[PDB]
mmCIF file of C-alpha atoms and ligand atoms in Angstrom:
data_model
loop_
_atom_site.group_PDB
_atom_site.id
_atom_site.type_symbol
_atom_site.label_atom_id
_atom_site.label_comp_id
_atom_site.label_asym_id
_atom_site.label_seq_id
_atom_site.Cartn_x
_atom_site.Cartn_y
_atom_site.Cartn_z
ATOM 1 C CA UNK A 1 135.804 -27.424 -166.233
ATOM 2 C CA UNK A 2 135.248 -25.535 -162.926
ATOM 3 C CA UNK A 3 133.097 -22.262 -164.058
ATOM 4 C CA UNK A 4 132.156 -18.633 -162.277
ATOM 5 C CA UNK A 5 128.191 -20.262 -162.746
ATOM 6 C CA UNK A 6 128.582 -22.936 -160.937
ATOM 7 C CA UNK A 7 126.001 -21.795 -158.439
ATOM 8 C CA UNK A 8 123.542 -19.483 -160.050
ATOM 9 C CA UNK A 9 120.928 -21.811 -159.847
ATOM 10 C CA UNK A 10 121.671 -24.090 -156.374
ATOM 11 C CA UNK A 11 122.547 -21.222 -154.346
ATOM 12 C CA UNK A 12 122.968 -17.829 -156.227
ATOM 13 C CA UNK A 13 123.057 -15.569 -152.730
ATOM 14 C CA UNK A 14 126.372 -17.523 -151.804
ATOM 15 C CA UNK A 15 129.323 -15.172 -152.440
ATOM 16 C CA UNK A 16 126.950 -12.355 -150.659
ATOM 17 C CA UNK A 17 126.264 -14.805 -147.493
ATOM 18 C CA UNK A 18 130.835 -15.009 -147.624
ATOM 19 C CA UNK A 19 130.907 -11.642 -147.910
ATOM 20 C CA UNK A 20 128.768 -10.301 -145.003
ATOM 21 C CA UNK A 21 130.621 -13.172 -142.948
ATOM 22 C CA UNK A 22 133.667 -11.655 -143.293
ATOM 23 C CA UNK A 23 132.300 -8.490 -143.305
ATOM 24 C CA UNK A 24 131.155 -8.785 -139.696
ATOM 25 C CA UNK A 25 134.283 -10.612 -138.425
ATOM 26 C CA UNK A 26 136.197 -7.879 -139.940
ATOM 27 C CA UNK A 27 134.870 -5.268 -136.811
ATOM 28 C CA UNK A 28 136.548 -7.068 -134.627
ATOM 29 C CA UNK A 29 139.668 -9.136 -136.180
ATOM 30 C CA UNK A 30 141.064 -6.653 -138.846
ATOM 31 C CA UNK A 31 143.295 -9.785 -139.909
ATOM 32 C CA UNK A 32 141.021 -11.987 -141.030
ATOM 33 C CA UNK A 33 141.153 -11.203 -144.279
ATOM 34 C CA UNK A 34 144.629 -11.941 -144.764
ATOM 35 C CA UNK A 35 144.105 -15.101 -142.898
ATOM 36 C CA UNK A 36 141.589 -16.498 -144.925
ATOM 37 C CA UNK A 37 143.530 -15.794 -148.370
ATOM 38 C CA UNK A 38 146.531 -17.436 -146.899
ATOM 39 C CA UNK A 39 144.011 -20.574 -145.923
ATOM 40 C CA UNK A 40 143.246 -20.985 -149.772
ATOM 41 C CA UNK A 41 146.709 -20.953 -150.549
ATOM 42 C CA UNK A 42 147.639 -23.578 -147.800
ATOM 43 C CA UNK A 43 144.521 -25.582 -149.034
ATOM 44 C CA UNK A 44 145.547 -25.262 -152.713
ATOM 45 C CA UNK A 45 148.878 -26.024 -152.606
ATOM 46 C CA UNK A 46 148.543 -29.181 -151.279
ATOM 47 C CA UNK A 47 146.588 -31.866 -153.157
ATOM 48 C CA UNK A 48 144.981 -28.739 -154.875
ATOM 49 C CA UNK A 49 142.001 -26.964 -153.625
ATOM 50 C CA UNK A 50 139.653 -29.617 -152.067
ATOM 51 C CA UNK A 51 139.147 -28.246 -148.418
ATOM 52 C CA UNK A 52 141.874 -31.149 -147.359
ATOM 53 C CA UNK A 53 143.234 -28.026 -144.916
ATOM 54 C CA UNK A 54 140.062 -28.152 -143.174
ATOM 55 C CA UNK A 55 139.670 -31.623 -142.132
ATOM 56 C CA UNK A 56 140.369 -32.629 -138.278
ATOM 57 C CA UNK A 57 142.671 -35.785 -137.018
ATOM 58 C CA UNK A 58 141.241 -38.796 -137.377
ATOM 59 C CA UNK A 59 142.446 -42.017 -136.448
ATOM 60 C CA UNK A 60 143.693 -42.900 -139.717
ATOM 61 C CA UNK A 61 144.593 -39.449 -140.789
ATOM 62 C CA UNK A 62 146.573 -36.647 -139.250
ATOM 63 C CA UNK A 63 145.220 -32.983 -139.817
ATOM 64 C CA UNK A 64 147.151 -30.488 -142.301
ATOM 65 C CA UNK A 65 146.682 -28.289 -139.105
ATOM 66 C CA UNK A 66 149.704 -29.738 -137.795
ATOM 67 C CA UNK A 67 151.997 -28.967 -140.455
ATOM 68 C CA UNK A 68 155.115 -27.015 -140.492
ATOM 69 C CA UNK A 69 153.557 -24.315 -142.126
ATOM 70 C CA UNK A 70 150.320 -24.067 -140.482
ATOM 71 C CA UNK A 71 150.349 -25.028 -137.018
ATOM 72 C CA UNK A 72 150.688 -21.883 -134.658
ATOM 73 C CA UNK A 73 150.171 -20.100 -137.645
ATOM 74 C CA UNK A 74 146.889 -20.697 -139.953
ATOM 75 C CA UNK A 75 144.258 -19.054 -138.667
ATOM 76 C CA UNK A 76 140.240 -17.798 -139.385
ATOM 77 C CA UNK A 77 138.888 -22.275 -139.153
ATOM 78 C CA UNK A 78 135.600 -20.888 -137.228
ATOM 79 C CA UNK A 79 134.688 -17.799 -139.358
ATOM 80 C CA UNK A 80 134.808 -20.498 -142.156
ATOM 81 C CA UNK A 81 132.343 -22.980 -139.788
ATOM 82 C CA UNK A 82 130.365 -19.698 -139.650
ATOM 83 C CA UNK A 83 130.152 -18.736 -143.555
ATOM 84 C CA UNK A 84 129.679 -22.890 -144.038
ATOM 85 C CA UNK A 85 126.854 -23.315 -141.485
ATOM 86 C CA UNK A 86 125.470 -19.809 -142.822
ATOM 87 C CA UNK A 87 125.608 -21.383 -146.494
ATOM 88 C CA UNK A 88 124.233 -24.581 -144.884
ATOM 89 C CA UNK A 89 121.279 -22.897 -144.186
ATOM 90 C CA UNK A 90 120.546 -21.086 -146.983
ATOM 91 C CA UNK A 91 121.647 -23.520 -149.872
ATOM 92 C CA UNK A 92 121.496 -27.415 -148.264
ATOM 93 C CA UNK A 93 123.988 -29.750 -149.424
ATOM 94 C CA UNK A 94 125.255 -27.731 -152.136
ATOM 95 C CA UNK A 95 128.431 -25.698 -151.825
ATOM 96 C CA UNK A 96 131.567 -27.739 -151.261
ATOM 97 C CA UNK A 97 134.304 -26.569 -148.585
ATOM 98 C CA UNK A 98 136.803 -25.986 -150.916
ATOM 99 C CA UNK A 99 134.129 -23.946 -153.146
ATOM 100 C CA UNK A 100 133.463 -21.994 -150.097
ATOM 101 C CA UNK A 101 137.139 -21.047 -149.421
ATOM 102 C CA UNK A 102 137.822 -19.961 -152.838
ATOM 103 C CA UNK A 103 134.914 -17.631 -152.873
ATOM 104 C CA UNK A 104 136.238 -16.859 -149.223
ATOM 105 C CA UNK A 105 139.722 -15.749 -150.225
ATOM 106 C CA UNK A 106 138.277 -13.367 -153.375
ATOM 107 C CA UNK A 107 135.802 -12.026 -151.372
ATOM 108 C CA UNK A 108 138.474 -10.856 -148.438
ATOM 109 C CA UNK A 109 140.462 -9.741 -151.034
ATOM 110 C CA UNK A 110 138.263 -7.377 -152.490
ATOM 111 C CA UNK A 111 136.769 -6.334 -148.743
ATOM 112 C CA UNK A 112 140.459 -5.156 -148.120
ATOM 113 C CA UNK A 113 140.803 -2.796 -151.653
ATOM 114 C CA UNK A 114 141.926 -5.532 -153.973
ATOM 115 C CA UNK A 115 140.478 -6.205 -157.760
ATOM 116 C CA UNK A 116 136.334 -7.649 -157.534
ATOM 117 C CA UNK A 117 135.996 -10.895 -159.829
ATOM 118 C CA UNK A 118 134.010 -14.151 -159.702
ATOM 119 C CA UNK A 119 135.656 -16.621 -159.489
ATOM 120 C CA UNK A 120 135.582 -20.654 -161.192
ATOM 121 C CA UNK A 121 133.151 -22.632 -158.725
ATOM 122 C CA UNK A 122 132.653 -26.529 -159.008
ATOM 123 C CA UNK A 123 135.331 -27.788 -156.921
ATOM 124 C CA UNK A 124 134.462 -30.830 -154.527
ATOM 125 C CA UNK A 125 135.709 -31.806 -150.962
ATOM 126 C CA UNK A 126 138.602 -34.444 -150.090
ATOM 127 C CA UNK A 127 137.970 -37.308 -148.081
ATOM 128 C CA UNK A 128 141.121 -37.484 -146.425
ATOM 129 C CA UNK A 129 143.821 -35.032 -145.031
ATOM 130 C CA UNK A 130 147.238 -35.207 -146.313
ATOM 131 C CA UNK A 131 149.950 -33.821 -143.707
ATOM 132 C CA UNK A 132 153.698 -35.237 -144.914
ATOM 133 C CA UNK A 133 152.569 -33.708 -148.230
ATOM 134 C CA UNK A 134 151.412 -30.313 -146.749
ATOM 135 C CA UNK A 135 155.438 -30.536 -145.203
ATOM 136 C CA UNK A 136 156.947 -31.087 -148.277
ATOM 137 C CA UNK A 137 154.474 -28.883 -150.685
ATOM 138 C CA UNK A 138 154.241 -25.416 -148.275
ATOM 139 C CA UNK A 139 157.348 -22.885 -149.148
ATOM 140 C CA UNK A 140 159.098 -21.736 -146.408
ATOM 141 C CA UNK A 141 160.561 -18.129 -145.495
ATOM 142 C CA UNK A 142 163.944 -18.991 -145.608
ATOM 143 C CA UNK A 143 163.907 -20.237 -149.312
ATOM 144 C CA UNK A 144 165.798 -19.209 -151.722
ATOM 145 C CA UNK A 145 164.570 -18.064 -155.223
ATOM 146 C CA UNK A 146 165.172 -21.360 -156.761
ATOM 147 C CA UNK A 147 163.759 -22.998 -154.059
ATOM 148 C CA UNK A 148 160.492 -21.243 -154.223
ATOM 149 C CA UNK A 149 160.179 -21.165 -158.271
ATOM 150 C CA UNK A 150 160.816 -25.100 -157.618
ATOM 151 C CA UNK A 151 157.937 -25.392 -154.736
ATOM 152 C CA UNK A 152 155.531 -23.632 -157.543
ATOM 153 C CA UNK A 153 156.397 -25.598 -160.172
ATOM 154 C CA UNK A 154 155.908 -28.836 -157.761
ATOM 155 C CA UNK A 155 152.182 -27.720 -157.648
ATOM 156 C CA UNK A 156 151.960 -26.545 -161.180
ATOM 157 C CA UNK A 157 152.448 -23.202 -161.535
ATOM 158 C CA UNK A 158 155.338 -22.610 -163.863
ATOM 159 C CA UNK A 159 155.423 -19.279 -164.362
ATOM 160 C CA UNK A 160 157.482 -16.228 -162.655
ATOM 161 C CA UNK A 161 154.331 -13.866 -162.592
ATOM 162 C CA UNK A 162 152.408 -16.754 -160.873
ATOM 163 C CA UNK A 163 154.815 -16.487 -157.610
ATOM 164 C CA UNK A 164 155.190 -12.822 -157.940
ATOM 165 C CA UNK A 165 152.055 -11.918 -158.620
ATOM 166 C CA UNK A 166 150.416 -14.024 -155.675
ATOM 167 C CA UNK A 167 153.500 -13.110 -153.247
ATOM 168 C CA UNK A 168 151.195 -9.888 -153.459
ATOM 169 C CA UNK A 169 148.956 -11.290 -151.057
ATOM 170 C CA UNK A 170 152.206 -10.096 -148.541
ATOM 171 C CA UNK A 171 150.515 -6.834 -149.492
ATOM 172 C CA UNK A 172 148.384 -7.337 -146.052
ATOM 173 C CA UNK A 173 148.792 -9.523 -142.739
ATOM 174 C CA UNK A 174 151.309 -10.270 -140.452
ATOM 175 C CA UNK A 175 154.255 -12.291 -139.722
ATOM 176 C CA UNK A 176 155.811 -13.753 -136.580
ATOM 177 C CA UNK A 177 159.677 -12.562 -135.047
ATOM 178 C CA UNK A 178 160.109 -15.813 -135.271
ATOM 179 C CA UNK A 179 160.520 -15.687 -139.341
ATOM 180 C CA UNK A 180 162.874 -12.845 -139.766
ATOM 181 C CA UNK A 181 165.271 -13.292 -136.502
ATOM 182 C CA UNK A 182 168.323 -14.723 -139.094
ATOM 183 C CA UNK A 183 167.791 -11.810 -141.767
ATOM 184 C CA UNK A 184 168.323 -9.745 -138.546
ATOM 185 C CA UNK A 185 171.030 -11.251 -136.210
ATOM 186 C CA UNK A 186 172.414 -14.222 -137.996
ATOM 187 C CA UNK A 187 171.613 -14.445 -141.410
ATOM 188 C CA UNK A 188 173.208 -17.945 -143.075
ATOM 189 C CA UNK A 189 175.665 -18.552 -140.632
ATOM 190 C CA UNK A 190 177.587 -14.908 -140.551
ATOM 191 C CA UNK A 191 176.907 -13.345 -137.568
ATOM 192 C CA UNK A 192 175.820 -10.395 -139.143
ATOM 193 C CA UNK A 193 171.944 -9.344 -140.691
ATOM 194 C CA UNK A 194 170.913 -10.111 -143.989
ATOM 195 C CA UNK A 195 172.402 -7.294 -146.612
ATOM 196 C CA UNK A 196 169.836 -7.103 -148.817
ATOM 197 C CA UNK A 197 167.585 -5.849 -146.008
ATOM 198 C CA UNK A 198 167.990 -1.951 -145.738
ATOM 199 C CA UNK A 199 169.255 -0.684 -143.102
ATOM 200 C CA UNK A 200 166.591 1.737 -142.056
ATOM 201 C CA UNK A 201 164.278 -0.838 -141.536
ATOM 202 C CA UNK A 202 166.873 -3.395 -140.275
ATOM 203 C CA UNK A 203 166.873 -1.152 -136.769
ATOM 204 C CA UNK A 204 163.043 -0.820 -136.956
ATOM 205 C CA UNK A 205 162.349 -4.542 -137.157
ATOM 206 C CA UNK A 206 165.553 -5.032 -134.841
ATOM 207 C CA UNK A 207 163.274 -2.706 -132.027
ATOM 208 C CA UNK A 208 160.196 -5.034 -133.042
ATOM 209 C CA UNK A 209 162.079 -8.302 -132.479
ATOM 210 C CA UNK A 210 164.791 -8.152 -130.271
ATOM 211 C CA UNK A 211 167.350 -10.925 -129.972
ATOM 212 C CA UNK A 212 165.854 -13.180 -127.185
ATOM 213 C CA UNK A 213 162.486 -11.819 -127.679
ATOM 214 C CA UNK A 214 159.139 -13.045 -127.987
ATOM 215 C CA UNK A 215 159.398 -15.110 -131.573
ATOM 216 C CA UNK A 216 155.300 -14.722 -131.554
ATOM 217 C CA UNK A 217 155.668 -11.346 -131.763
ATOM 218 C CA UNK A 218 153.800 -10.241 -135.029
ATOM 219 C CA UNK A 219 154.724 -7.674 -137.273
ATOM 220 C CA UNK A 220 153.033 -6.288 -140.541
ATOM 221 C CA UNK A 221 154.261 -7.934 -144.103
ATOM 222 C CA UNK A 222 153.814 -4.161 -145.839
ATOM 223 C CA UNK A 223 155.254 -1.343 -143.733
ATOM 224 C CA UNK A 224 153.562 1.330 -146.118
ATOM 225 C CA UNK A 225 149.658 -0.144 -145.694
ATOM 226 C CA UNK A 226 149.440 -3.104 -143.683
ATOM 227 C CA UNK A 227 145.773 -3.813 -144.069
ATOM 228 C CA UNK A 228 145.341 -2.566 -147.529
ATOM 229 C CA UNK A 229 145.433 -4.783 -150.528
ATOM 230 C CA UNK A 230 147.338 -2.867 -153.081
ATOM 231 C CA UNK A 231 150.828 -2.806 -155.070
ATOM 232 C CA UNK A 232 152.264 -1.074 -152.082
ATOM 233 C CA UNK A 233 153.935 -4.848 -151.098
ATOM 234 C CA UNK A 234 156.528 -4.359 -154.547
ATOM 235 C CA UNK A 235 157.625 -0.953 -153.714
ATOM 236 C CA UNK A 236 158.698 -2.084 -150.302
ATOM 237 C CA UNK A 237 160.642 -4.528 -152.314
ATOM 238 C CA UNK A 238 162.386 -1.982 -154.624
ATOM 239 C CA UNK A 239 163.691 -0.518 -151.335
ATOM 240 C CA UNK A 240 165.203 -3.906 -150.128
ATOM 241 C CA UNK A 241 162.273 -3.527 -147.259
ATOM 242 C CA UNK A 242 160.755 -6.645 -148.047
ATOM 243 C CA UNK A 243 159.671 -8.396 -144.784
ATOM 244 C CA UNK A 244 160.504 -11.715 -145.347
ATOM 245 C CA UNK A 245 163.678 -13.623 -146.701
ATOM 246 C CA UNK A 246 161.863 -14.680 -149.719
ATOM 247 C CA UNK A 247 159.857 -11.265 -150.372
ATOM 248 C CA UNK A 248 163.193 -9.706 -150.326
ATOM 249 C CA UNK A 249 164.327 -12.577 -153.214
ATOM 250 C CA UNK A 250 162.163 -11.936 -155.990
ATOM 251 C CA UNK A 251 164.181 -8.737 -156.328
ATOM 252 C CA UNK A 252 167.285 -9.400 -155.172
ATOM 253 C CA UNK A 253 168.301 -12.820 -155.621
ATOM 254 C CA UNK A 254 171.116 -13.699 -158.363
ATOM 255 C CA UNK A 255 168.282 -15.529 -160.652
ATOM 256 C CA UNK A 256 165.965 -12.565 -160.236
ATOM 257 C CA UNK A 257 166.283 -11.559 -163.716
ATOM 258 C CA UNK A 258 162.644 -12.887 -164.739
ATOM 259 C CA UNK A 259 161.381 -11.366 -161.626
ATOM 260 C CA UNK A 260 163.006 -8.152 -161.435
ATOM 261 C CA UNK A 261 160.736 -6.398 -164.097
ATOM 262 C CA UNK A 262 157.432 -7.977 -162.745
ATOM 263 C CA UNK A 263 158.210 -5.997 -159.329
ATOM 264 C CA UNK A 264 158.574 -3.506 -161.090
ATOM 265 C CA UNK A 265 155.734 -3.729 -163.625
ATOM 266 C CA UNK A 266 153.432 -4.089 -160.445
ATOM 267 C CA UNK A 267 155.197 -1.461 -158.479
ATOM 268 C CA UNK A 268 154.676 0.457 -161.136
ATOM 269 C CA UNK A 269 150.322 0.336 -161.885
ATOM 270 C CA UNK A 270 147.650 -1.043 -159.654
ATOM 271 C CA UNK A 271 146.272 -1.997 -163.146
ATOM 272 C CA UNK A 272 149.210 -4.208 -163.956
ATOM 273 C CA UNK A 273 149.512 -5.776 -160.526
ATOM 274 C CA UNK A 274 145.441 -6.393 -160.136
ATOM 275 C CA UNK A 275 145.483 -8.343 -163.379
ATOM 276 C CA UNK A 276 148.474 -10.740 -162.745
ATOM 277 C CA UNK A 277 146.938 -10.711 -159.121
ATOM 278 C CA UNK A 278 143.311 -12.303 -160.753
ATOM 279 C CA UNK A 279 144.748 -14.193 -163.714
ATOM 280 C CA UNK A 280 147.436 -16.022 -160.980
ATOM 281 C CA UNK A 281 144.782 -16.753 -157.952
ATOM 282 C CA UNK A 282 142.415 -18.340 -160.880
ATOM 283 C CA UNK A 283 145.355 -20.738 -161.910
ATOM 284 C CA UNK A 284 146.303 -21.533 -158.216
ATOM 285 C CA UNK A 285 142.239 -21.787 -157.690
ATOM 286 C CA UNK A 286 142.532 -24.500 -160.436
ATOM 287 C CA UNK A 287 145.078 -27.040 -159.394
ATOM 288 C CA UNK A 288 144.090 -30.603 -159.563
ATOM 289 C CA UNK A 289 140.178 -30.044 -158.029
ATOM 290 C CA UNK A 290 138.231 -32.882 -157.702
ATOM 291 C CA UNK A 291 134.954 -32.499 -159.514
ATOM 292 C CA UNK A 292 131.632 -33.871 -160.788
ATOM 293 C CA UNK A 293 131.083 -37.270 -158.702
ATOM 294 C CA UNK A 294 134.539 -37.025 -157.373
ATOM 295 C CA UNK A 295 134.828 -36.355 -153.833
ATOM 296 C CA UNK A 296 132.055 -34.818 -151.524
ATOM 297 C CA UNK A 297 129.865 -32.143 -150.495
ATOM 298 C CA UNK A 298 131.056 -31.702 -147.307
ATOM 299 C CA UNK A 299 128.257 -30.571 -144.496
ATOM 300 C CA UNK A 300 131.216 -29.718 -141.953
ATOM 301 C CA UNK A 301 133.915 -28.421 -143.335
ATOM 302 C CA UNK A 302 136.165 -30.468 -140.558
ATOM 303 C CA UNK A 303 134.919 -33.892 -141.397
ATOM 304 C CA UNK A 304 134.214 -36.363 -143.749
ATOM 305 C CA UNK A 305 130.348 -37.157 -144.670
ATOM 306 C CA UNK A 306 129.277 -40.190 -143.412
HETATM 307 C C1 HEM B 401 156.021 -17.822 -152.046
HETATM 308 C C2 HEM B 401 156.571 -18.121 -150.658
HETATM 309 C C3 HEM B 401 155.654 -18.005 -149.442
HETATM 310 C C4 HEM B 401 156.238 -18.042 -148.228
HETATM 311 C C5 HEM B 401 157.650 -18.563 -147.929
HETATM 312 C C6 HEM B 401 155.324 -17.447 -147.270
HETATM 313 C C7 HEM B 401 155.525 -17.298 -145.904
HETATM 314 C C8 HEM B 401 154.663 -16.732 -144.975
HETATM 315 C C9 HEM B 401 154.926 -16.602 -143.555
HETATM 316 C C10 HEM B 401 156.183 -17.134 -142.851
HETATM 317 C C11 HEM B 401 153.885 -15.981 -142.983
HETATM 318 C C12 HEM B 401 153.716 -15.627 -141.493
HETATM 319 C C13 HEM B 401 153.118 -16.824 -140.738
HETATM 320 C C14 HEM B 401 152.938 -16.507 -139.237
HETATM 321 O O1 HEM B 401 153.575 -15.558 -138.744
HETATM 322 O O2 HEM B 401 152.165 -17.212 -138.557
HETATM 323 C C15 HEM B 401 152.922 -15.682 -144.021
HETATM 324 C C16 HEM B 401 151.764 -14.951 -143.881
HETATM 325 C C17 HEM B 401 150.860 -14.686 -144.911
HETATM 326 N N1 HEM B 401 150.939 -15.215 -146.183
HETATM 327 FE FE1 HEM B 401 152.628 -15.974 -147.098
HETATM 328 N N2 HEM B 401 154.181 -17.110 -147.959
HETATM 329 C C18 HEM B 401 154.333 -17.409 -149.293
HETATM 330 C C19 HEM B 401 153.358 -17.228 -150.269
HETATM 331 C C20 HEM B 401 152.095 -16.649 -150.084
HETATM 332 C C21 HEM B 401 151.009 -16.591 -151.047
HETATM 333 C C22 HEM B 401 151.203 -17.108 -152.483
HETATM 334 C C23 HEM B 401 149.939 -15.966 -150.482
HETATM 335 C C24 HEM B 401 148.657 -15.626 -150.873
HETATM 336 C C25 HEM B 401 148.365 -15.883 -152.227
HETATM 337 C C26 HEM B 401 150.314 -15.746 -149.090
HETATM 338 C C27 HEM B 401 149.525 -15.053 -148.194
HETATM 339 C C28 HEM B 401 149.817 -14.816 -146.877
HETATM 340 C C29 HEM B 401 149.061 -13.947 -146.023
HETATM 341 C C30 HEM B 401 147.774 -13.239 -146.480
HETATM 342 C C31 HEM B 401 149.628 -13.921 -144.814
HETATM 343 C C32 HEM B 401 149.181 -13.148 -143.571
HETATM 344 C C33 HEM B 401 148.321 -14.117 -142.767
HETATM 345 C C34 HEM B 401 147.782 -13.571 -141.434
HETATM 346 O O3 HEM B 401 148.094 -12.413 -141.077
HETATM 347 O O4 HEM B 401 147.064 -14.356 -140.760
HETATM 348 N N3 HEM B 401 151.598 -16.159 -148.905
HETATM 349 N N4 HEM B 401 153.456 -16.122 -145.212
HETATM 350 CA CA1 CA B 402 144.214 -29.109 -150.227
HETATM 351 CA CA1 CA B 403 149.230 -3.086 -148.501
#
């Protein structure tokens, strides 16, 4: 069972070593929060949480990095090679990658406003990279509601406040043109923008990504406090200003009727939202870890021990 302990004994200073990582990053790249919580979720959702995002190419293996979902996209690898060689130091040979990017993820989340908990600790690293499954396991923007209950459930998360509460993480960061240019210009084949966007905000992200723009081009995921972690991301939603195709989903969509009143439970108190935010990281945090012998201990977080 992985447990909050875990390292009280081995290397009790490590969530503060995380923390004043990020910390200092933070002066200069106000993103890297959000980065590194989106890392976890890329890591977890694909053979679970075992650092398998963080591995290299190899000859035999190609690197996660090269997914659909991640390359030109994941970001924050070296601040992780920092915290790890920082941890390194301090604690040697004792806190797995995929340990480290757990307590990573909480500890950003809390640095940008969001609940303070410890979390489970005992997870061990993979000794190989898996990129076709990283394809097939990472959600994409343009899913549909069904689709993206379906891509939880594929990982083990069966339950509506798991993807609504952790589509709070949308609460921060930012997102390319690239991802929204159908809601805007063409949305499923029509010529015409995406109605469930609002119109308001359909001319403001129209001015931010212009047809034949630059599909780099990154704008915020929360329009009311982009850098904030809060419940700010689910009233955007009950305004039809969700950023994304899928944000805009878990209130709008025809099966939205088990979603519906979770948006609007966590619109509705910080409380609420900060609960299901915890309780649902924990249970993503938990899919199929390796642990006790299993796997490694990594010593760099993008290669296998030998
Ligand atoms: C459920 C469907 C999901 C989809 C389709 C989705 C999609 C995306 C997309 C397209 C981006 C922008 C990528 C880029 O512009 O390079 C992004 C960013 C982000 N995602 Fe999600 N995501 C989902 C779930 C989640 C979850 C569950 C979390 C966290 C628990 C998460 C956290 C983040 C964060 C923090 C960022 C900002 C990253 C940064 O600014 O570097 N996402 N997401
Ligand atoms: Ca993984
Ligand atoms: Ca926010």
């Amino acid at each position: 069972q992985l447990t909050p302990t875990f390292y009280d004994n081995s290397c009790p200073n490590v969530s503060n070593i995380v923390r004043d990582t990020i910390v200092n990053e933070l002066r200069s790249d106000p993103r890297i929060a959000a980065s590194i919580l989106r890392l976890h979720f890329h890591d977890c959702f694909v053979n679970g949480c075992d650092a398998s995002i963080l591995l290299d190419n190899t000859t035999s293996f190609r690197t996660e990095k090269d997914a659909f979902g991640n390359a030109n996209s994941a970001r924050g690898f070296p601040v992780i090679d920092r915290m790890k060689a920082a941890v390194e130091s301090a604690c040697p040979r004792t806190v797995s990658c995929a340990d480290l990017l757990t307590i990573a993820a909480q500890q950003s989340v809390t640095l940008a406003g969001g609940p303070s908990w410890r979390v489970p600790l005992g997870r061990r690293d993979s000794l190989q990279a898996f990129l076709d499954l990283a394809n097939a396991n990472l959600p994409a923007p343009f899913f549909t509601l069904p689709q993206l209950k379906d891509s939880f459930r594929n990982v083990g998360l069966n339950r509506s406040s798991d993807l609504v509460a952790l589509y709070g993480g949308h609460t921060f960061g930012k997102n390319q043109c690239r991802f929204i240019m159908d809601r805007l210009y063409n949305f499923s084949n029509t010529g015409l923008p995406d109605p469930t966007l609002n119109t308001t905000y359909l001319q403001t992200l129209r001015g931010l990504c212009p047809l034949n723009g630059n599909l780099s081009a990154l704008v915020d995921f929360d329009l009311r406090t982009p850098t904030i972690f809060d419940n700010k991301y689910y009233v955007n939603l009950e305004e039809q200003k969700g950023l994304i195709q899928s944000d805009q989903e878990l209130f709008s969509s025809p099966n939205a009727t088990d979603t519906i009143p979770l948006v609007r439970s966590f619109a509705n108190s910080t409380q609420t939202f900060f609960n299901a935010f915890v309780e649902a990281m924990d249970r993503m945090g938990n899919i199929t870890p390796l642990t006790g012998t299993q796997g490694q201990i990594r010593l760099n977080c993008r290669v296998v021990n030998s």
